[PDB]
Design a protein around this ligand. Structure first.
Ligand SMILES: NC(=O)c1ccc[n+]([C@@H]2O[C@H](COP(=O)([O-])OP(=O)(O)OC[C@H]3O[C@@H](n4cnc5c(N)ncnc54)[C@H](O)[C@@H]3O)[C@@H](O)[C@H]2O)c1
Ligand SMILES: NC(=O)c1ccc[n+]([C@@H]2O[C@H](COP(=O)([O-])OP(=O)(O)OC[C@H]3O[C@@H](n4cnc5c(N)ncnc54)[C@H](O)[C@@H]3O)[C@@H](O)[C@H]2O)c1
Ligand SMILES: Cc1cc2nc3c(=O)[nH]c(=O)nc-3n(C[C@H](O)[C@H](O)[C@H](O)COP(=O)(O)O)c2cc1C
Ligand SMILES: Cc1cc2nc3c(=O)[nH]c(=O)nc-3n(C[C@H](O)[C@H](O)[C@H](O)COP(=O)(O)O)c2cc1C
Lengths: 326, 326
C-alpha cells in the first residue's frame, strides 16, 4: 500500500490500520468493510452469545469479504460466566489466523492460540502489562492510552507518553490505540515508535458500521469533552459517551459506599446494546472516545483508510520535509 | 537551524523548542542556557519577589547570553496579592520582546503588552480558551495537554486529541506543551498541527538547570506513573511529583470537606522552593510531568536541543520516508 511497517508485514494487510474489538458493533458488516478497505478487521467474539453463534458469524463475514480478518476475545469482569475455552475452540476450528485479546490474565488463552498457529495481538494499558504479554509470546501488543474508548486501566497515562515509554522497552511490533482518527494521528503514532494505529470510535462513524444513524450523528455532534469515566471508584474505569445514564452512574459513585450491585442495572450490556440498535443515546451506557471531537463526517471504510494513509503521506512529504528544506 | 516553522519565523529563534515558565527554577542560568542553545527561553517573573528584582534578574540574564529571551507572567490563584501591572511595567521597560502569559483572564495584560510592541504567547488548556486568546490578539498560543507538569485545567484532554482539535480551529502558530522530551515528541507535535514544543520537566534534567542534583536524580529515577494530581476537589488541579506531601494532600481531599485553608501550609511555594534548593524531595510540593518516565539523562542544554532536532530529522528522513519507500 502507501505505508509499509512491521505491522503490515507481520499481519499481511495493506494499511497500518486495525479495527479492534467492539462489543455489539463488531459484527460481520463492520469487519468485512474494514477487511475489504485494506485494514486489519476483527469480529467481536463476545458479541455472539455462544461459540456456535460465533462460528456462524465468522461464516457470515466470509460471505462479505474474501480477505482475512481477526477475532477479538475480551477477558474482563463478567456478570455471567463465559466459556472462553469454547469460544477459543470455535475461533481456531474456523481457521482464524489472528486474534486480539484484551483484559486480565490472557496467559492461558495466548498459549493455546500459539499452539495452533494463530498469531496474537494483546491489548493492554501499561508498559508492564505489554512486557508481560511479550514474555508470553504474543506477536504484537496494542498499547491503549488514556484517550481510548473503553477500559484504559487506572494509571491515566495518555498515548503521547505511554507509546514512547512502551517503545523504549518492547521488541514486538506496537499498535497505538486510543485517540486516533486521521493521518495526523497515524504519523504521530509512527513517530512515537508504533507501527500501526487501532481505532474504535472512528469506525463507529462510517457508512458500513451497523449501528443506528442517530448514534453516528451523536458522534459527529460530540466534542472531545463529551465522555465520562464511569466505575473509577470500583477500579474498573470505562470511558463512555456522556449521557443521562453515565451521569447517573457518576452521581451514585459520588455519594460513597457504591458497589457494583448499585449500578449493575444501569451499566448492563443489554441496555447498552439497544443504544446501537434503536439509536436512543440515553437508553444505556455506550462506548465512545474523546477522539469524537475530531470526527464530524461519515465516510465509507474504503475511502476513510485511503484518506488516512494519503493524508499521512502528504504530512511527511510536504509538511515535515518542507520544514527541513527551509 | 534544522527545522523551520511558523514558530522559529515568528519569534526569531533557531529551534522550534521553547522553555516555558518555571516557578523557582526559571532563573537567569536556566534562561541563558536555553537561549544560548537556540531555543525560546523564559525568565519566570513571579520567581522574582518584586518588579525591581525582576529587572535585576533580566539584567543578570543578559550578562550570560546575548540572545533574546522572554519572560513568563503567570496569573493563577495567589495566596498574597501580586502587583501584576508593575511586573508588566518592568518587563516592558527592560525591552523584553516576547512574553508567555498563563492562567485566568489574561486580557488586560495581553493588550498592554501589544500596545508596546511585545509579542505574546498565551498558554492555555482548552480550545475555547485558545480561541478567546486569539481573539485578544496574541501572537501564538501554547496548548497545554493533560500530560503537563503544572495546571492542566479540568477537562482532562491529552495532547494527542487536544492538539489536533486546537489546530482544526486556530490560525496563529501553536506550541504544543506537556508530555514532550525528545525528537519523537517534536515530530508527533508537528504532525498533529503544532509548530513547536514547550518543555518544562525536560529542562529540569539538564546540566545548567539551577536546582539541587538530587532533584535531577529523582526525575531520572521516576517513571511515568510517579506524579499526583492535587487540588482536584478545589478545581485547581496541579500535576506534581509524587511525594509524601502530595500524598498527604490527596489523603486530606479524600476525607471530604477540604477547603484550600486545610492544605495551604502543605502546598505553599515557600516549602516547595526548598525542594529545588536543598534537594529534599519530600520537603514540599514540586512540579514534575509524567514525561519524567522518558527521561534518564542530564545533557547540556545545547546538546539536548541539537539532539532533539537531529533525532526528529532522522525520524522523518529515515523512519517515516523509509515506510513510504517500501
Ligand atoms: N469499550 C470496551 O472495552 C467494552 C465495551 C463493552 C463491553 N466490554 C466488555 O465485553 C464483555 C461483555 O460485554 P457486556 O457489556 O455484555 O458485559 P456486562 O453486561 O457485564 O457490562 C457491565 C459492565 O460492568 C463491568 N462489570 C461486570 N461485572 C463486574 C463486577 N463484578 N465488578 C465490576 N465491574 C463489573 C463490565 O466489565 C462491564 O463494563 C464485558 O467483560 C465487558 O466489560 C468492553
Ligand atoms: N507548574 C505550575 O504551573 C506552577 C508551579 C508553581 C507555581 N505556580 C504558580 O505561580 C504563582 C506563584 O507561585 P507560588 O507557589 O509561590 O504560589 P502559592 O504559594 O500561593 O502556592 C499555593 C498553590 O495553591 C494555589 N492557590 C493559591 N491560593 C489558592 C486559593 N485561594 N484557592 C485555591 N488554590 C489556591 C496556588 O495556585 C498554588 O498552586 C502561583 O499562582 C502558582 O499557582 C504555577
Ligand atoms: C463501541 C465500542 C465498543 C468496544 N468494545 C470493546 C471490546 O469489547 N473489547 C475491547 O478490548 N475493546 C473494545 N473497544 C475499544 C476499542 O477496541 C479500541 O481499543 C478503542 O476504541 C480505541 O480508542 P478510540 O475509540 O479513541 O479509537 C470498544 C470501543 C468502542 C467505541
Ligand atoms: C518546576 C516547574 C515549574 C513550573 N512553573 C510554571 C509557572 O510558574 N507558570 C506556568 O505557566 N507554567 C509552569 N510550569 C509548566 C511549564 O511551563 C510547562 O507548561 C510544562 O512543564 C509542560 O509540561 P512538561 O513538564 O511535560 O514538559 C512549570 C513546570 C515545572 C516542571
Amino acid at each position: 500500500g502507501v505505508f509499509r511497517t512491521r505491522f503490515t508485514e507481520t499481519f499481511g494487510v495493506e494499511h497500518p490500520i486495525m479495527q479492534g474489538g467492539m462489543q455489539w458493533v463488531g459484527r460481520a458488516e463492520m469487519a468485512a468493510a474494514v477487511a475489504n478497505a485494506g485494514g486489519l478487521a476483527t469480529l467481536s467474539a463476545l458479541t455472539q452469545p455462544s461459540p456456535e453463534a460465533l462460528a456462524a458469524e465468522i461464516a457470515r463475514c466470509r460471505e462479505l469479504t474474501d480477505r482475512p480478518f481477526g477475532v477479538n476475545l475480551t477477558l474482563l469482569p463478567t456478570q455471567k460466566p463465559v466459556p472462553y475455552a469454547e469460544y477459543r475452540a470455535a475461533i481456531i476450528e474456523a481457521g482464524i489466523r489472528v486474534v486480539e485479546t484484551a483484559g486480565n490474565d490472557p496467559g492461558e488463552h495466548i498459549a493455546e492460540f500459539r499452539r495452533h498457529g494463530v498469531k496474537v495481538i494483546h491489548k493492554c494499558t501499561a508498559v508492564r502489562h505489554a512486557l508481560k504479554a511479550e514474555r508470553l509470546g504474543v506477536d504484537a501488543v496494542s498499547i491503549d492510552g488514556f484517550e481510548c474508548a473503553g477500559h484504559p486501566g487506572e494509571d491515566d497515562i495518555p498515548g503521547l507518553v505511554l507509546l514512547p515509554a512502551a517503545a523504549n522497552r518492547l521488541r514486538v511490533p506496537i499498535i497505538a490505540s486510543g485517540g486516533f482518527a486521521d493521518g495526523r494521528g497515524l504519523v504521530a503514532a509512527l513517530a512515537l515508535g508504533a507501527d500501526a494505529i487501532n481505532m474504535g470510535t472512528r469506525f463507529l462513524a462510517t457508512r458500513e458500521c451497523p449501528i443506528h444513524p442517530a448514534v453516528k450523528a451523536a458522534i459527529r455532534a460530540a466534542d472531545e469533552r463529551s465522555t465520562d469515566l464511569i466505575m473509577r471508584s470500583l477500579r474498573n474505569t470505562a470511558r463512555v459517551a456522556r449521557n443521562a445514564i453515565s451521569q447517573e452512574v457518576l452521581a451514585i459513585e459520588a455519594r460513597g459506599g457504591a458497589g457494583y450491585a448499585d449500578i449493575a442495572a444501569l451499566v448492563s450490556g443489554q441496555r447498552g446494546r439497544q443504544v446501537y440498535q434503536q439509536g436512543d443515546t440515553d437508553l444505556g451506557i455506550w462506548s465512545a472516545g474523546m477522539v469524537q471531537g475530531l470526527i464530524d463526517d461519515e465516510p465509507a471504510c474504503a475511502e476513510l483508510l485511503r484518506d488516512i494513509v494519503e493524508q499521512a503521506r502528504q504530512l511527511v512529504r510536504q509538511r515535515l520535509e518542507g520544514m527541513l528544506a527551509g
